[PDB]
Amino acid sequence: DITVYNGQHKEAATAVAKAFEQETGIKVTLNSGKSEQLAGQLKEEGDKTPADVFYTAQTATFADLSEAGLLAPISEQTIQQTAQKGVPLAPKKDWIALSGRSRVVVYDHTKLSEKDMEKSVLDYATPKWKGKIGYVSTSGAFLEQVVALSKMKGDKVALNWLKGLKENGKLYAKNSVALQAVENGEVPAALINNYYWYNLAKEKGVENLKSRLYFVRHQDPGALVSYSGAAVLKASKNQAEAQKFVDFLASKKGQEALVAARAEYPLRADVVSPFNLEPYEKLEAPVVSATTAQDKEHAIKLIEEAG
Ligand SMILES: [Fe+3]
């Protein structure tokens, strides 16, 4: 049996954990929490951690753990299973990316068309979109979007984008609420994450929704994908079962279990989502460095300056 520190959504974790128990017979105990908090705990615990595996919603939390010498190497065959072009790779082959979540523009297709959409996420924060664009400034993915803009286009562009949304956007408390506002005719478009919409579409049927998705693609900052993954702790005294779990997560069966539970993009090339997501390759996600805690602190500062 293994202990898994779980930073991912409990339905994702529970699903893969139950599918693992059926394929192998090995029990999984989850210890859930925020990815950043669990990473801190793993570092404090060090060589006396009870964790066998860290299953995290954000691969960025691995960087610090890897540099602290706290992660075990993973099989090269296992890493290769999800190593599509664009997918973040551990320089020391000591963690693996497993699935992705995408930024997207949702729009009311009875009021706007794909031809009305913009080639960059930058362009939505302009007077053309007053007040026709929803955004969610408190959302974690929104913060990640700001960090990506700062890294890819520089700080002045990121701040200008935020100031543009202040001037031209409609603020919503949550992504779910922004999606409702679009469906309800309150705002014709919004910046959200993909999974909210794909879940609604699976549940209601796409034909019964006013809204559709527009993906900016071509490695625009607004094509940002955030990655979930896993690592084995070097301190684990159950390496064999911990590695078996991570191997399972990268396997066809492990990926099928994940995509049935959550509308995330599988990173295997041979797995299709029952939510009817596009292949990961078609997203044309940018390549960006891991978000550090320092990156997030800085993005919050920019959100503050913008009002
Ligand atoms: Fe959310």
Curated annotation (Swiss-Prot):
Gene3D superfamilies listed in its UniProt record: Periplasmic binding protein-like II (3.40.190.10)
Subcellular locations according to the entry: Periplasm
GO molecular function, one term: metal ion binding
Induction: By iron deprivation.
UniProt cross-references to PANTHER family, sorted A to Z: IRON-UTILIZATION PERIPLASMIC PROTEIN (PTHR30006:SF15), THIAMINE-BINDING PERIPLASMIC PROTEIN-RELATED (PTHR30006)
Classification via SUPFAM superfamilies: Periplasmic binding protein-like II (SSF53850)
Main function: Part of the ABC transporter complex FbpABC (TC 3.A.1.10.1) involved in Fe(3+) ions import. This protein specifically binds Fe(3+) and is involved in its transmembrane transport.
GO biological process, one term: transmembrane transport
Complex formation: The complex is composed of two ATP-binding proteins (FbpC), two transmembrane proteins (FbpB) and a solute-binding protein (FbpA).
InterPro entries: Ferric-bd, SBP, SBP_1_CS
GO cellular component: periplasmic space
Phenotype when changing residue 1 to A: In strain: PAK12085 and SB33
Binding site for Fe cation: 9, 57, 195-196
Effect of residue 36 to A: In strain: TN106
Designated name of the protein: Iron-utilization periplasmic protein
Family label: Belongs to the bacterial solute-binding protein 1 family.
Biological source species: Haemophilus influenzae (strain ATCC 51907 / DSM 11121 / KW20 / Rd)
PROSITE patterns membership: SBP_BACTERIAL_1
CDD domains: PBP2_Fbp (cd13543)
Alphabetical UniProt keywords: Ion transport, Iron, Iron transport, Metal-binding, Periplasm, Signal, Transport
